[PDB]
């Protein structure tokens, strides 16, 4: 009573709330995009609705942040859903990394929610371990995520250029343990921990940048999933088994992937490599027999024990009793950093970068059809309402 | 560039703009109402859109102004689209008159725009001659217009209780000429000028309250209409002829109705009364022969000339050269008011009202099916997006 208008206005001012101005503005743009067809305009309700909102919706699109406000400098990445571009804001002259997700393929492959957790993690984590999202916007064909540009590349590139000693492996693994703990702290399970999603900032420190497979845990820190997700080499046995139905696992699947990552860093090969994907899946499931260290692998007993501690069945895997039993594993005993200050210390490898558009740590890329015209209302832009966000 | 966000925000703060917060909030509520059905939720896009907006939309409806915030004191009117109720705001203890328009019958009879001009005239006219709209809101079944309560009743009630002398007729006609000039000033043609739409305020002064038939004039002060509108007794010949197609008329149709009103006031009968509606239409068209004054009608030559000046074909009707030739007709020569101060002078009849809920000048009323469940998206709440307005 009386303060109900002030309470309602408070919901529209909250960027966490799904009814903020940009989300309400999306609700209108999506409706105009999904009704503006010759076929649907046969409806007297639709045609009169469009006649009074067509002009203003087209003015609003042009007034809002658009793809045209950035100069594409170079395409540095290219997933199945779209490319990651090194862009420069025309007005601010600032260099960001912008991810494009095809609205066609994201809707077409049924995948229309994986980006929500990515959006919320980047926009609101406020963690030094998570790449920050400055602006999320969209157009009829793509979603756009303007994020901080990580100029040092990924850990795949590092491993390809260096024989990683255990002094460096201790470091990168610790930064990954803390980044995952920050994600788990936010009530999420990564599910796609791999060196490809571990980026290095301008000083050589780690940040996790891809969050497509993230999934919110229930009040028991558990997840119910009947679909295998992640990269073949790093999928834990519990996530593989989940494909057959009755999938019930927790955050320990991320610690499995850490162990695969640490093995790859020290050995130079994935622990369960095979030519077929099914050959890799067989080795992962049969880990008790298939996990072995090459006789030329220069690895300590502590490093081997930590890898074996992670590469076991979830029931007895390190990390089941919290992150503290990971942090106090003798492998992390070092005279360069502490868990409370590791990000303030010198990184093993500091990227050499001549300019704000230097993308030397990213391999060159050598350069998504249109949605069909609907006979009846389909509402293809409906899963995208509320994607827009401005920091 | 840069100020584009401030320019965009300025559109959402403007109550005249169709993309203000309440209009954007309507766009969401209408979408949720028109998609929440078992049949439509078979669509993967629709079902997932609803799952993330159902809870918050139902919280927003309850937070916003609702029909339940008013105490219905008495039903005082009852048109074909809905009733006018004398209500009292539960929190403010303030008495308003609230008009309910059936969303079912307004959509069902194809009439889904007549209320727009009424809403804008009342909400934004700021004229002492137009009843003010304080809040416009809506629910799944009705539109709601919370307006100032006119406690003196209409001119039909006055004429039924009094033998109106020409001293009073000069007054009520002048107030009607100024009220229509204010509407014409706003670029509108009333089209339904009748004593039923002329209400008396707490002091006995006039205000026009129904604007359903209003129509915006083009840059030539003309309108293109192929449909007869208004009340049979007061329809001008040009509006009757418009029914046969090729309707092109201006604001002079309102001056015709003024003359019918003045005749009714002085003679006590409508100038073209007949038992059939077609008998009335014949008399209106044949006005040159059918208009006559009873030999017992106590009317002056100036009053008869003004009525005849209004009841002619549009081509030569008084008001074609502006409102000044109406204002200087000798019939208005009086020693009580001037055109510039008529509303500050004493009204002929001041209503006797014991309390803020006294509705003695309104006859007692002796007390709209549901929309069908749609197989495919119909968007029945779409013509109502942007009706909500809070002063
Ligand atoms: C920079 C890059 C980014 N993405 C990104 C792009 C390409 C990547 O690697 C390619 C493909 C995988 C194997 N190695 C080469 C990795 C990450 C982001 C995301 C946010 N900020 C960023 N700044
Ligand atoms: C009071 C009344 C109002 N409507 C209204 C209701 C009933 C009317 O008359 C009945 C039917 C026609 C013949 N005579 C009796 C006229 C106008 C409004 C509108 C805004 N404020 C109001 N305050």
Swiss-Prot record, chains A, B:
The lineage of its organism: Eukaryota, Metazoa, Chordata, Craniata, Vertebrata. The active site is at 192 (proton acceptor). The chain holds residues 23 to 417 of 1388 of the full protein. Homodimer. Interacts with IRS1. Interacts with RAF1. Interacts with RHOA (activated by GTP), RHOB and RHOC. Interacts with PPP1R12A. Interacts with EP300. Interacts with CHORDC1. Interacts with BRCA2. Interacts with NPM1; this interaction enhances ROCK2 activity. Interacts with SORL1. Interacts with PJVK. Protein kinase which is a key regulator of actin cytoskeleton and cell polarity. Involved in regulation of smooth muscle contraction, actin cytoskeleton organization, stress fiber and focal adhesion formation, neurite retraction, cell adhesion and motility via phosphorylation of ADD1, BRCA2, CNN1, EZR, DPYSL2, EP300, MSN, MYL9/MLC2, NPM1, RDX, PPP1R12A and VIM. Phosphorylates SORL1 and IRF4. Acts as a negative regulator of VEGF-induced angiogenic endothelial cell activation. Positively regulates the activation of p42/MAPK1-p44/MAPK3 and of p90RSK/RPS6KA1 during myogenic differentiation. Expressed in the brain (at protein level). The modification Phosphothreonine is found at residue 388. ATP binds at residues 76-84, 99. This is Rho-associated protein kinase 2.
